[PDB]
Amino acid sequence: RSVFSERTEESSAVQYFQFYGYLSQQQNMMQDYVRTGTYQRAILQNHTDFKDKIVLDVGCGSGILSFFAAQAGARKIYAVEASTMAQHAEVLVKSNNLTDRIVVIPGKVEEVSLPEQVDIIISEPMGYMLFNERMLESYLHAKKYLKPSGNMFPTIGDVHLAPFTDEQLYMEQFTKANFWYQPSFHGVDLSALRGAAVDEYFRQPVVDTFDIRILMAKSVKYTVNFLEAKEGDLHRIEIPFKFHMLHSGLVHGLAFWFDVAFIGSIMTVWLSTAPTEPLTHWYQVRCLFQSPLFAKAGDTLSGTCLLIANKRQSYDISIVAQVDQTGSKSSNLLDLKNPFFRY
Amino acid sequence: SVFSERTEESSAVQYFQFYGYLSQQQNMMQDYVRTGTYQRAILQNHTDFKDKIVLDVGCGSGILSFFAAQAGARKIYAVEASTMAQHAEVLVKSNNLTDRIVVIPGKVEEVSLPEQVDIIISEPMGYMLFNERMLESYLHAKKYLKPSGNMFPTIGDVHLAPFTDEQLYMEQFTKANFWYQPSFHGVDLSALRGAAVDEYFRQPVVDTFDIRILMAKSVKYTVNFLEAKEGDLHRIEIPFKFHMLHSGLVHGLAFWFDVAFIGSIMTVWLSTAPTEPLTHWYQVRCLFQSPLFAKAGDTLSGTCLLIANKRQSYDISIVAQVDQTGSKSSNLLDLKNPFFRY
Amino acid sequence: SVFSERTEESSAVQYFQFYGYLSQQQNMMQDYVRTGTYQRAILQNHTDFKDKIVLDVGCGSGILSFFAAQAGARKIYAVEASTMAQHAEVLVKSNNLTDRIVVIPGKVEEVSLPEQVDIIISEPMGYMLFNERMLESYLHAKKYLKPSGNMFPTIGDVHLAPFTDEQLYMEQFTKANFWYQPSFHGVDLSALRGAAVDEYFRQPVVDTFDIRILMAKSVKYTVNFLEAKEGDLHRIEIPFKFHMLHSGLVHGLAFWFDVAFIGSIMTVWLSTAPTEPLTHWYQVRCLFQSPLFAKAGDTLSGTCLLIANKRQSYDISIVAQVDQTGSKSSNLLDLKNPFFRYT
Amino acid sequence: SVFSERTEESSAVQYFQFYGYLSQQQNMMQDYVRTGTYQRAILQNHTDFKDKIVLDVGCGSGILSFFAAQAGARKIYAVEASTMAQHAEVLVKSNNLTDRIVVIPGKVEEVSLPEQVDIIISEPMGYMLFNERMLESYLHAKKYLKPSGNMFPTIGDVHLAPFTDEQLYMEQFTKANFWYQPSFHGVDLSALRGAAVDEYFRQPVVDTFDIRILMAKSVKYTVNFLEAKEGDLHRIEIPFKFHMLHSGLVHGLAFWFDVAFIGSIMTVWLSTAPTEPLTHWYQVRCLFQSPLFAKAGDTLSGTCLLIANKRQSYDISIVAQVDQTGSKSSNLLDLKNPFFRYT
Ligand SMILES: COC(=O)c1cc(O)c2cc(NC(=O)NCCCCNC(=N)NCCC[C@H]3O[C@@H](n4cnc5c(N)ncnc54)[C@H](O)[C@@H]3O)ccc2c1
Ligand SMILES: COC(=O)c1cc(O)c2cc(NC(=O)NCCCCNC(=N)NCCC[C@H]3O[C@@H](n4cnc5c(N)ncnc54)[C@H](O)[C@@H]3O)ccc2c1
Ligand SMILES: COC(=O)c1cc(O)c2cc(NC(=O)NCCCCNC(=N)NCCC[C@H]3O[C@@H](n4cnc5c(N)ncnc54)[C@H](O)[C@@H]3O)ccc2c1
Ligand SMILES: COC(=O)c1cc(O)c2cc(NC(=O)NCCCCNC(=N)NCCC[C@H]3O[C@@H](n4cnc5c(N)ncnc54)[C@H](O)[C@@H]3O)ccc2c1
């Protein structure tokens, strides 16, 4: 039984790979110039890491990263993709006269057979909030094909978490559930479901961008080193935090973004999704507290963000947060698989 | 006395204490619409006052008696229960009108007058017209009115109209949601959120608003002071059927009133409607705890029931219904604890 | 089960997950044409419900059952297969109606009812009426209907008409021409342009539009739910012969539908036509691969063939020719994957 | 009852009506200085509470009792005379503390408490510390205090300082001069001007102010709640001799207060001084009838006599004199009828 199928509900995998089979989705991702230009720069400026080397491209989609590795001089690139996009990748490899160097291997990286070990693995394994889609585990799984000296592009990933204040976002989600307070919608009392409705809406992480002035403390960083991490490390991800509050006011939740670094032989190239940086198709992610916490400047906001992988290729998110000085505590559960796209 | 029988002593003490303050008198007198309109009603109907006997109920500083004197009254009995009666007597002497204005200290339900009067003047209107229950004292004073005497004001019109105001609703809704907190300094308050919502939404909101928030033609409820009895004001039932002109959320009902001075020379109107300059009565809005949705052309039907209480005010019951869909709203309000938002 | 034999498990999982969300219930309930017309149809035909036995197929939060209760029904069996069933149960208790509404979690093809019913109520219509294949569940439920029995809705009319929309047509190639460039970061993408075009044209466009784009009076295809059987919906052939009211280029066919509640006291209609206020069903347009020129008074004839698939939707095949000239066009579309264009 | 004999019914009615409102509880609870300081005082002196018996006098919604429970109190009697006692009970039940907090509706002068307590907690301070005459109920409750028990707060310090505020002084006459016109709609109002003036000057002004209007270091009058008897508060004679730090016109006296929680571990201070963040106690200013000129280095002497009355408040008689010149002034004010000037 493949490692992939054992961790993944089939109904989730069918939807997931159908979504990624669409050329329109490829175009959406490729037109992110920050993402595409930073990947090409990371590969081309570290060309010695690719010249005359064997490369594995995990989840290659249309194959763009494999074309970048070929531009950098790779001797051989195995491009693995499990969606039907694999067949379009083959078309581009032929139309670009790279049949001698790029070899598309359709299927899941956990189930294919690669002809040889590789010098470097390249991929775009990052989902929303970094961890969504559980692709990082496939990326890590692929290290079974990596030589001892081998490198990984990207090499590390940093998840950033910071408390924010945004009463408009909070009230927007809060009043959405207010529909269910009605004691007489067309004569029907709906209010018994108001609780369940508010929980539903607040379980959705909010995906959009925000002004960095809504952040109330320096971010906390949590780092995964892809060269050293193992698949199982991502089944349960525990991120403690202790924020030193820089402004007073209501904390409505935690904001999340991530950076990855391509640590090459010639230079390290960073790809950032921080709200201080140009927007990308990852945006940023915010998990709202069902009830905001009040904190004064100089207070400490401490707790834990716990991510439990689930069989729908995503994570159950638990956030418990505490204003230490007063003992005001907030607990929240979020379903990362189904965010609210607000942008 | 009729007054004491219907009034808790603690309420009456505070009430007449409030009206004893000259600053409160100044506040009402500086309302130029109020004072200029009353003077216009009296002076322009001077034939209803020339060489007549007048009763002024709750005269305060006495301004209306001075107006009656300017219009030619022969004798004016000015009745006032608060300590302001002594300041009014001071003004009568300083204005050399001791021969025409006779201040009688006391409650109009309790004092004695030496003769029947031709006309009664008063400012009995509180917030939403009925607050303070002064209209019953005004009506009670008709025991001193000659058989065809007049009353200034003569009639009163209460208007009510549904309104939409998401900001006002959310402001009160959000105040109450402080008690949703599961861990305020470590304490779960949420068990009291319902009670908080009740308390905040029982408060009539006294302020003014742009008329664009009104979603139907107002419905009018008329009290004819020449005809009504005290007891008519103990339980006031106001049915309403609104024909909706706009679609959206009805957050509550807005109230205002006009009074008419029906004199022999002219009728003169004093209006507190939102289409008119602001007065110290403002306008009053009763919020539904949950708004009702309605489309243009639906009818919004229900009843506003006012029951007088012994704190000189009213318990307000509003039941309303979108007839087409059966969406219903029931609400209770304490007119004596208004929220002054202006 | 009849439902499982016609439905891939992967499609059913996602389908019911979707209808488990209160936000989806909320969106449908806030469609005032939808909710208000159903209430009007039921209450104004109160003698079809007074002291009757009712079956509610796919009741969601249960609102149609509450309407049947407002109309005096003695017993209502409300069947719902998604997790929304648990929420309907809460509402039946909180509205003190456990004595009259019995919520039955499950597929109507799999549950058991204790007794036969006088009337079936349902909202089985999807996009283009037929999407979701819920009509078959509605018809299947007739095994529980008494010979006298009625159905609410009683009939459904699907309307087809030819439209001209130059801008909608050209948009497809503007999108696809993203791939028609020789050096996207060094890669020649042009070989995938044809596939990108093909992908866009297979999507029905869910949108509303101005009725002035219609070039001929609509043609109607009627399903009588009192007479139809499930298998009648596996292959739906809709012939058409449009008489062109205007000259121009025909870029596709527009779809909408009405249903009628044929009651003892009156017939009430729910219409999603572009001449009526917009509903959450919108309208649907299927483009032709190549536009067809027709002159006013010409005749545009052909067929729309809908073939049910196991993803709870239809493969759409449309063929059309202008009789006077012979110019012909086709198109194959996947109703399961509409393009939501509404703005 | 002691409370009955010192309080007119009309005043008591309105008083407990006012504190029956949850909006009033919310106002005080949302004062972070008030709420947070009480919490720190109790929590940071946990050895004063662990396994101890506690009396909470005038508990309102019950917050201090929950704090005493957080600190490990074995048992807490929470006494409240307003209808708010019913809401505190609800909160005790919802917080699963029925075993440790017992809510006693009624006046502390009239309830029966089952046993002596180790420590009394309360918030008995009104405007100017003494308004409302709650301190007497707090001291009366020491009939239930074990010998060697403690009081939280332990001491209260009222502060008096001379101030200059020309605009506040002139404002009285600008308001009264409304009456000084010969023909207000034809009526000569001028004979009431002097009465209007007198009315305004009887009112203490509740307001905050810039500390730069203060003309001398405050004089402090200390009540030690562990030693004082309730009779000590019936007549409070506060002598003062101010060493003027600035030259100018003295228009009246400013008042504020501090309280100290003198715990076994530490002492915590709650301050309403104008040098500190504003609280819902604000500050209080009593004008002299006429200003007194004083040079820096002069001494301003006199007395502030607070005479308790049956309206749960005080008559304030202030006499003051510039020693080096003999210039004297005075005023008599009704603390029950303050003018709230804050903007
Ligand atoms: C209402 O509708 C929903 O409910 C819904 C829910 C969502 O949440 C929605 C979210 C949306 N966007 C989004 O997520 N934007 C973030 C940008 C990430 C862009 N891509 C990436 N970096 N992700 C990871 C790489 C993926 C590639 O790798 C392949 N691949 C995976 N696994 C394997 C394997 N084992 N073997 C071989 N190949 C594999 C796979 O096929 C791909 O080609 C949009 C619509 C959404 C709709
Ligand atoms: C819960 O927070 C509170 O504590 C609170 C509550 C309120 O609701 C608050 C409301 C506030 N303003 C307000 O109401 N503005 C509307 C303008 C009304 C303008 N005056 C009028 N038309 N009132 C009726 C006539 C009164 C005169 O008639 C005398 N009078 C009464 N009865 C008798 C009697 N039997 N015999 C002889 N004389 C009698 C009485 O002494 C007076 O001179 C402010 C603060 C408030 C504070
Ligand atoms: C990007 O992401 C996608 O890929 C995607 C694809 C879509 O196309 C998307 C399309 C979207 N809108 C849409 O569809 N708008 C029209 C809907 C009309 C309103 N709903 C109705 N009338 N449908 C039919 C009734 C259904 C009820 O009946 C229940 N039910 C079904 N079967 C059974 C059974 N056997 N037993 C018992 N109960 C059953 C079921 O649970 C329900 O409660 C939105 C998001 C979409 C997302
Ligand atoms: C002239 O018009 C009036 O009439 C008037 C006069 C005023 O001056 C006005 C002043 C206003 N604001 C104000 O004061 N702002 C300062 C913040 C005070 C912050 N609260 C506090 N620390 N107060 C003392 C504790 C009270 C608690 O203790 C309870 N309690 C009392 N006695 C007993 C007893 N014997 N037994 C059991 N429980 C008892 C009581 O029920 C409470 O829960 C507003 C309206 C006012 C109206």
Residue numbers in the entry:
A (entry chain B): 135 to 477
B (entry chain D): 136 to 477
C (entry chain A), D (entry chain C): 136 to 478
Question: What do the study authors state?
Answer:
Protein arginine methyltransferases (PRMTs) are important therapeutic targets, playing a crucial role in the regulation of many cellular processes and being linked to many diseases. Then, another series of compounds (12a–12h) were designed and synthesized, introducing also an adenosine moiety and exploring the distance between the three groups. We also report crystal structures with various PRMTs supporting the observed specificity and selectivity. On the contrary, we were able to cocrystallize the compounds in the complex with both PRMT4 and PRMT6.
All six cocrystallized compounds (12a–12c and 12f–12h) adopt an overall similar conformation in the complex with PRMT4, revealing two common anchoring platforms, the methyl 4-hydroxy-2-naphthoate and the adenosine moieties, each one occupying the same binding site on PRMT4 regardless of the different linker lengths. On the contrary, distinctive conformations are observed for the linker in each compound (see below for details). Surrounded by such a “frozen” binding site, the linker of each compound adopts a unique and distinctive conformation stabilized by interactions with the protein platform in a region mapped on one side by catalytic residues M260, E258, H415, and W416 and on the other side by F153, Y154, and E267. Depending on the length and the nature of the linker, strong hydrogens bonds are established with such frozen sites, and the number and the strength of the binding interactions of each compound appear to be correlated with the affinity and, consequently, with the IC50 value. As revealed by the crystal structures, at least a two-carbon atom long linker between the adenosine moiety and the guanidine group is required to bring the latter within the catalytic clamp formed by E258 and E267, with a three-carbon atom linker (as in compounds 12g and 12h) being even better. In addition, the trans conformation imposed by the double bond in 12h is less constrained than the one adopted by 12g (also featuring a three-carbon atom linker between the adenosine moiety and the guanidine group) and, therefore, more favorable. On the other hand, we were pleased to find out that compounds 12f–12h, featuring an increased distance between the guanidine group and the adenosine moiety, showed a remarkable and selective increase in potency against PRMT4, with a consistent gain in selectivity over six other human PRMTs. Compound 12f interacts with PRMT4 with higher affinity (KD = 25.2 nM) compared to 12g (KD = 51.7 nM) and 12h (KD = 75.9 nM).
